[PDB]
Amino acid sequence: MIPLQHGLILAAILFVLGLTGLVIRRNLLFMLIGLEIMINASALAFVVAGSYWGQTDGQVMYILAISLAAAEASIGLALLLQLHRRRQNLNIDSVSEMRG
Amino acid sequence: WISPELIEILLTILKAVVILLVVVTCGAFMSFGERRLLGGSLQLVADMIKMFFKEDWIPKFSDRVIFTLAPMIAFTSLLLAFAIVPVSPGWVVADLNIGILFFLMMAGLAVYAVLFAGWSSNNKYSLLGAMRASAQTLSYEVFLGLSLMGVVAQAGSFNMTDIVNSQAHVWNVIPQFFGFITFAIAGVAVCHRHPFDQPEAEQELADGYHIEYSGMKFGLFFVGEYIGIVTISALMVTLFFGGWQGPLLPPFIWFALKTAFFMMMFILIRASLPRPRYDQVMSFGWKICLPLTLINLLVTAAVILWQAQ
Amino acid sequence: TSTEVIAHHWAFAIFLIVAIGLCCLMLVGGWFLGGRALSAKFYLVAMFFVIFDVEALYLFAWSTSIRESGWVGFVEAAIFIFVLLAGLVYLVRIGALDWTP
Amino acid sequence: MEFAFYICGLIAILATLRVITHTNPVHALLYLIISLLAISGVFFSLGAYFAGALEIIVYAGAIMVLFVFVVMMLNLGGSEIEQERQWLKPQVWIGPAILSAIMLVVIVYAILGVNDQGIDGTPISAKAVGITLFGPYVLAVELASMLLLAGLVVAFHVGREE
Amino acid sequence: MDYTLMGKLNDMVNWGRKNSIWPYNFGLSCCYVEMVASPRQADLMVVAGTCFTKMAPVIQRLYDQMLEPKWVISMGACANSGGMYDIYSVVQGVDKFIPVDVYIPGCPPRPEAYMQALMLLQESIGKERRPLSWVVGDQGVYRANMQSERERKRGERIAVTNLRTPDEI
Ligand SMILES: CCCCCCCCCCCCCCCCCC(=O)OC[C@H](COP(=O)(O)OCCN)OC(=O)CCCCCCCCCCCCCCCCC
Ligand SMILES: CCCCCCCCCCCCCCCCCC(=O)OC[C@H](COP(=O)(O)OCCN)OC(=O)CCCCCCCCCCCCCCCCC
Ligand SMILES: CCCCCCCCCCCCCCCCCCCC
Ligand SMILES: CCCCCCCCCCCCCCCCCCCC
Ligand code: SF4
């Protein structure tokens, strides 16, 4: 009784909001937060699609998605801590040394 | 306005409310019992009145929402985790298909009370003590679920009534003994009970996170801790000691006897055991209890698959 | 859509609502009444918790369907748990889980 | 299950909109936790019970705990970003908001016009997910263990103190 | 009795504050070691020891950190008046800078004298009027002028005739 279009539109809205947060925020922590919003939105879209078809593959894709989300959040926060302890500054525009 | 469907839903709602009120009052009475063993109901009512009519002082340099939100989490997390516990046939709040997973959800949310209290209490020492306490609770929440997973493997489902029915012949304390001891250790360590009381006592650069909480927020932390040990005891009963199943007594009598026995045993091991060092606690968790839960799950699966012709 | 399931849904909803409202009312009554007048090891243990919690979720999914998967599922989960334990042994031996070096 | 889906989707959208435009990291992480709980309620409304349970257990109970840990240990007390609030200036956010709105419009136009019998919302249990996970998706499980090992090794090598 | 600057529940509030008293025992000096929670949670401060000038600010600060309603019990001659130390480095009494509700003579007092002081403080709490809320009603605290313990106990004390001789144990 819940349309597939509505669930996919909700997932698309969350994905777009996470991408906007990734773009407009200069702090690296908020960039990681936007990345987490984007990957959670894509996982929600997989769950919506799997629930529409009555298949378990959507939740399996969700499980792989959140495995990726956990591991890359760990890596990104480790790199954030390294940047903080090497520069005392989380500005992502300051770490821009290599240029064309 | 008379219909048996409305009567049924009203009676189920009334049963849920009765269960909730009995759990809260039992948590308060267990706080009284620990304070006395280490009228009384009138003294607890006096304590509640005093904490109500004492002024609630939020610190000036403290974040109000996080400071207010930490005791709410500390109460409501395990108080809501109780909702899956079947105390009697026909006396369960929610017959959820996820069950013990709902308990794991609530414990994972329960770590936020410690983190939020430490951050909002604007003090570096309190922050460091909360970081140590949260590291300890993560170190034991890492294997809480697997210690339950042995029993889940034996039952074949996450539903609690199915676990109670699968303990009809032999209670799960006998086959899942290592799951039982690991779940007891993890449940004590998640609720910050003795011997995992004060991880900040190993350093003078740290302080407890309950400091700067005055009056009703401190009361929320106190009653939330005791309600947490009540629901941990009830989960222990329903997962390892048959739940409500017994030969002669009514089922609620058996469940209440086992839960009261486990609450008294938690009081006894608080009064008896000494607290180990912090690094000893972390090493014991990560190096002993997690591999023991994994090996117990493997052995349980092998025994189940062998005993299926 | 039976009577029992909707009764338990209403009972669970009332349990959650009355619980959260009881905590809220406790704080409201406390506030209204009465007169007036770091180290990187924490990151390491939290990250280890996250990784081993995801691997625990895989074992959560396995544990509820052991009989339906048979011995083949046992072999696959045994390989999973072996890789998990080898990672744990590696973390212990390199001093990652050693709190006092 | 319909009203729950719509109200939880609304709460999730509002919470993440508050996340991306907030200055306090702990407040933003709290709103992110609220959005994750709302998304778990969305999962429960669609019958994906295992997915909602893991959304609270793992996403709102492990990953966001790691984020809160990092925020608390770095102690963001307004290090030359809170006192500026450059993302609230129109020239910084107006452009990317237009770009994201265009992307959302194109995606939503693609969503519409697709045949839809509706989501049944019937509960797909964790037993069925476990059967599929250790049945036709075995190598996914084993290489996901390898993926988490890779993340573990990378995060230890980069994030250790010495 | 006179008082110095809707009824049943006020009595219940006084009963709750009376039967629930969480003390903060300040060490200070030998009175505490005879007798042997955070100041935010405590509602009673028991000052028992010599008020030195170097830690009178410590006493004042830890008293200011407490939250209303708050009561003070001063144990021993040092906390009452300075005691035997009328000297340059000693504040002559706790009540020089913070208000004291109950005084106990002695050097040191016995622990059951501290229990007696707790009983007296319980009566004083039970016979006092405090504001119910910070938005409704009068925001004034009415301490009751209790009859002194020496006027109350005068008859039984003066009636004493003979005592045991000090030649025995
Ligand atoms: C300050 C307040 C902050 C917010 C607090 C919480 C807000 C919401 C409170 C109102 C809730 C209203 C009732 C919700 C529905 C209850 C019934 C329900 O969930 O039923 C659905 C499902 C039933 O499953 P089952 O019975 O097994 O099978 C039937 C076959 N279809 O059962 C399930 O799917 C069960 C799993 C879902 C259970 C969710 C429980 C609440 C989780 C959030 C806790 C928040 C804790 C405090 C804050 C933490 C930090 C932010
Ligand atoms: C009310 C206005 C807003 C007020 C503030 C926010 C409060 C929380 C609002 C969202 C959560 C409650 C929504 C209402 C749920 C009511 C119960 C319901 O709809 O149950 C139906 C269904 C039961 O399952 P099923 O068996 O499939 O039903 C068909 C029957 N054959 O149920 C399901 O399938 C699943 C039911 C939902 C999942 C469980 C609850 C999730 C809670 C998420 C909380 C998110 C954080 C909220 C924070 C609030 C403060 C900012
Ligand atoms: C510490 C224990 C907490 C228990 C909380 C729930 C209490 C529920 C009480 C239910 C009582 C009636 C049970 C059904 C009838 C069988 C027993 C009859 C004699 C009491
Ligand atoms: C039905 C009874 C079967 C008994 C024999 C079971 C053993 C034979 C089949 C084993 C299959 C194991 C597959 C494991 C794949 C691991 C891949 C790892 C990739 C990194
Ligand atoms: S009154 Fe006597 S016993 Fe008490 S602190 Fe003073 S000197 Fe010590």
Side-chain angles (χ1 to χ4, degrees), chain A, chain B residues 1-59 61-309, chain C, chain D, chain E:
Chain A
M1 70 186 74
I2 299 171
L4 171 69
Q5 279 110 10
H6 294 175
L8 296 177
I9 282 166
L10 162 71
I13 289 170
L14 300 188
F15 186 84
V16 155
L17 287 165
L19 182 64
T20 319
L22 175 59
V23 173
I24 71 179
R25 294 310 291 265
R26 204 174 49 186
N27 193 10
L28 180 54
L29 175 89
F30 282 88
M31 299 183 70
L32 293 170
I33 289 177
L35 283 176
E36 291 305 308
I37 298 168
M38 291 162 68
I39 184 89
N40 181 251
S42 318
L44 150 74
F46 251 121
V47 170
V48 167
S51 302
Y52 173 66
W53 292 105
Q55 307 178 11
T56 54
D57 304 63
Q59 302 195 47
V60 173
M61 286 309 294
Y62 173 82
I63 287 175
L64 300 184
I66 67 179
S67 304
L68 171 65
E72 83 188 356
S74 302
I75 296 176
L77 288 176
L79 284 169
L80 174 76
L81 289 184
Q82 202 61 229
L83 181 75
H84 179 77
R85 84 181 52 163
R86 294 297 166 179
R87 283 90 155 107
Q88 285 78 33
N89 183 33
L90 298 191
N91 195 336
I92 206 60
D93 294 356
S94 73
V95 45
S96 51
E97 167 179 334
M98 287 174 297
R99 58 188 65 251
Chain B
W1 60 93
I2 297 301
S3 56
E5 304 176 359
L6 187 66
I7 282 134
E8 175 69 26
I9 66 177
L10 254 297
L11 257 301
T12 321
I13 286 172
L14 191 135
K15 288 178 184 180
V17 171
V18 160
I19 285 178
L20 174 55
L21 293 183
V22 168
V23 167
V24 178
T25 54
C26 188
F29 273 20
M30 285 314 114
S31 64
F32 164 65
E34 177 166 310
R35 268 195 289 169
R36 187 182 69 91
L37 267 64
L38 305 186
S41 59
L42 294 182
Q43 187 171 355
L44 250 285
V45 170
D47 280 312
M48 296 295 294
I49 291 175
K50 180 199 79 69
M51 292 187 304
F52 260 111
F53 284 87
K54 175 167 287 299
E55 50 163 359
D56 265 346
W57 179 82
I58 305 179
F61 285 102
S62 65
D63 196 0
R64 289 179 170 263
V65 44
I66 306 291
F67 196 87
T68 318
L69 201 58
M72 304 188 64
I73 297 174
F75 202 78
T76 330
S77 62
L78 271 84
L79 188 130
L80 287 186
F82 195 87
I84 53 150
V85 174
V87 313
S88 186
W91 268 82
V92 68
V93 176
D95 206 331
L96 296 186
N97 294 334
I98 53 165
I100 203 59
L101 284 200
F102 180 72
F103 163 63
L104 295 182
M105 284 147 59
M106 287 302 115
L109 292 186
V111 76
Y112 282 114
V114 180
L115 277 179
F116 283 169
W119 185 82
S120 55
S121 67
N122 202 334
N123 189 15
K124 299 176 299 179
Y125 312 101
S126 183
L127 191 91
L128 202 139
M131 288 287 277
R132 293 168 62 96
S134 45
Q136 192 182 14
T137 54
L138 294 190
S139 164
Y140 285 77
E141 203 192 318
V142 76
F143 70 91
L144 179 76
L146 305 161
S147 59
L148 303 169
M149 259 343 102
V151 182
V152 166
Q154 278 182 10
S157 74
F158 289 119
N159 192 14
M160 304 293 294
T161 312
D162 300 6
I163 298 179
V164 174
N165 292 332
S166 72
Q167 285 160 21
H169 295 337
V170 39
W171 294 351
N172 273 146
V173 60
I174 302 177
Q176 288 301 310
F177 180 76
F178 301 96
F180 158 73
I181 55 180
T182 39
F183 174 62
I185 294 176
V188 167
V190 158
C191 300
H192 297 268
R193 287 290 295 181
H194 209 79
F196 316 97
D197 271 342
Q198 36 178 18
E200 69 276 359
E202 285 278 325
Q203 194 177 23
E204 286 292 332
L205 269 177
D207 281 327
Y209 56 93
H210 299 281
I211 287 94
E212 301 286 336
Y213 276 98
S214 60
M216 217 64 215
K217 302 180 179 58
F218 179 79
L220 274 191
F221 267 112
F222 205 58
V223 185
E225 177 174 7
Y226 285 98
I227 286 167
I229 84 179
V230 164
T231 175
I232 281 296
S233 306
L235 282 157
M236 182 89 57
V237 170
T238 55
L239 288 157
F240 296 98
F241 288 84
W244 41 262
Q245 290 176 338
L248 302 176
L249 313 176
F252 166 65
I253 300 301
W254 270 112
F255 177 76
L257 280 183
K258 299 167 192 176
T259 314
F261 171 78
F262 265 104
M263 274 136 48
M264 296 318 178
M265 288 319 109
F266 285 155
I267 300 302
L268 192 136
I269 65 172
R270 172 182 183 89
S272 300
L273 268 74
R275 46 176 306 267
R277 297 184 284 101
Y278 180 76
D279 45 355
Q280 276 200 0
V281 161
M282 302 277 293
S283 300
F284 173 73
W286 275 105
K287 296 174 187 177
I288 301 299
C289 289
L290 178 71
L292 184 60
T293 49
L294 298 178
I295 295 169
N296 172 80
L297 181 58
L298 269 183
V299 171
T300 299
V303 168
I304 286 167
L305 290 173
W306 202 94
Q307 290 283 333
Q309 295 85 16
Chain C
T1 178
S2 174
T3 310
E4 175 189 349
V5 278
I6 193 61
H8 276 58
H9 289 169
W10 272 107
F12 192 30
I14 292 305
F15 189 88
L16 302 156
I17 283 176
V18 171
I20 300 161
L22 166 67
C23 179
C24 287
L25 192 132
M26 221 155 146
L27 274 188
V28 157
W31 179 76
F32 173 75
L33 272 312
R36 293 277 181 83
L38 272 71
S39 184
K41 298 188 301 182
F42 301 113
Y43 168 73
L44 291 181
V45 63
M47 175 255 305
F48 297 156
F49 166 71
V50 175
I51 297 299
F52 282 76
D53 214 16
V54 178
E55 302 183 89
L57 99 82
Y58 284 96
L59 294 175
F60 293 166
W62 176 52
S63 302
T64 178
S65 61
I66 292 191
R67 296 174 182 89
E68 288 80 15
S69 297
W71 281 105
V72 197
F74 177 80
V75 174
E76 301 149 359
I79 295 175
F80 188 91
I81 291 180
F82 189 83
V83 174
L84 178 58
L85 281 173
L88 189 60
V89 163
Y90 159 80
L91 286 186
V92 169
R93 287 283 299 184
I94 66 192
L97 286 175
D98 194 7
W99 194 263
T100 308
Chain D
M1 49 92 72
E2 192 171 8
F3 164 73
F5 166 79
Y6 283 114
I7 195 62
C8 285
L10 175 62
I11 288 175
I13 289 174
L14 292 176
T16 182
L17 180 61
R18 191 65 260 190
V19 164
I20 63 175
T21 58
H22 215 283
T23 163
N24 193 13
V26 182
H27 287 176
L29 286 181
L30 183 58
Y31 282 115
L32 190 47
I33 293 161
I34 295 173
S35 64
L36 291 181
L37 296 173
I39 283 311
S40 180
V42 169
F43 289 162
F44 281 129
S45 62
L46 298 179
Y49 288 177
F50 196 41
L54 301 166
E55 185 82 3
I56 299 186
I57 281 166
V58 173
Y59 224 137
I63 300 173
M64 284 307 114
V65 172
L66 183 55
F67 267 86
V68 167
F69 253 85
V70 169
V71 169
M72 282 175 49
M73 94 169 46
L74 73 90
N75 266 315
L76 199 143
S79 295
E80 83 188 358
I81 295 187
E82 190 269 334
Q83 296 97 23
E84 181 69 28
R85 296 194 180 187
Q86 74 286 342
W87 67 94
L88 291 179
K89 291 179 174 56
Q91 319 94 22
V92 179
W93 78 267
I94 273 192
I98 288 174
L99 179 70
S100 302
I102 292 179
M103 186 184 293
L104 181 58
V105 159
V106 175
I107 290 171
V108 164
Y109 168 70
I111 301 294
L112 307 170
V114 178
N115 41 9
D116 195 355
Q117 306 168 18
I119 302 177
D120 291 330
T122 163
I124 295 180
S125 55
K127 177 181 287 303
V129 177
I131 287 170
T132 309
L133 209 55
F134 284 76
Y137 278 82
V138 166
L139 288 156
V141 181
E142 315 294 328
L143 300 174
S145 71
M146 286 302 178
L147 180 78
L148 292 154
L149 174 59
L152 194 79
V153 170
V154 169
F156 171 73
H157 177 75
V158 176
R160 70 199 197 280
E161 185 69 33
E162 184 264 356
Chain E
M1 56 186 64
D2 266 325
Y3 281 71
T4 57
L5 51 95
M6 59 179 179
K8 181 57 181 298
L9 57 103
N10 196 18
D11 174 65
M12 294 306 296
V13 168
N14 285 338
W15 177 86
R17 286 167 166 166
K18 163 200 303 180
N19 290 97
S20 185
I21 294 176
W22 298 346
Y24 189 84
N25 287 83
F26 204 107
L28 222 44
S29 197
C30 9
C31 267
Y32 174 77
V33 330
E34 168 67 29
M35 186 44 204
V36 170
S38 175
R40 299 297 174 184
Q41 297 115 29
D43 47 354
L44 162 67
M45 190 182 182
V46 183
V47 203
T50 311
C51 261
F52 308 95
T53 58
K54 276 185 71 174
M55 60 186 316
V58 180
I59 297 282
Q60 182 78 69
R61 191 173 52 88
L62 262 66
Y63 174 74
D64 291 334
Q65 289 174 18
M66 295 177 56
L67 300 180
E68 303 282 339
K70 39 166 78 174
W71 303 281
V72 179
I73 276 180
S74 97
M75 299 249 297
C78 283
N80 293 343
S81 47
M84 59 207 292
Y85 296 105
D86 200 320
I87 204 111
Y88 54 90
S89 48
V90 170
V91 179
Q92 299 303 289
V94 167
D95 58 352
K96 286 282 178 289
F97 51 95
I98 58 176
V100 180
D101 293 70
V102 182
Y103 301 86
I104 306 100
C107 180
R110 296 186 68 93
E112 47 269 14
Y114 171 72
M115 189 58 188
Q116 183 223 354
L118 274 178
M119 294 289 193
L120 294 191
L121 178 66
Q122 283 171 23
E123 266 92 63
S124 177
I125 287 172
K127 277 190 287 176
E128 80 183 354
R129 315 301 164 195
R130 304 192 80 105
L132 275 62
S133 173
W134 56 282
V135 290
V136 184
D138 193 13
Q139 300 301 313
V141 179
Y142 288 99
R143 279 87 154 81
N145 295 333
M146 308 276 300
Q147 188 193 14
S148 90
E149 280 313 279
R150 60 149 167 87
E151 295 273 12
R152 182 181 71 81
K153 286 180 162 180
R154 181 178 292 181
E156 58 169 329
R157 285 175 180 178
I158 301 313
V160 174
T161 299
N162 274 90
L163 303 167
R164 304 164 290 164
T165 59
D167 306 345
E168 305 273 354
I169 52 171

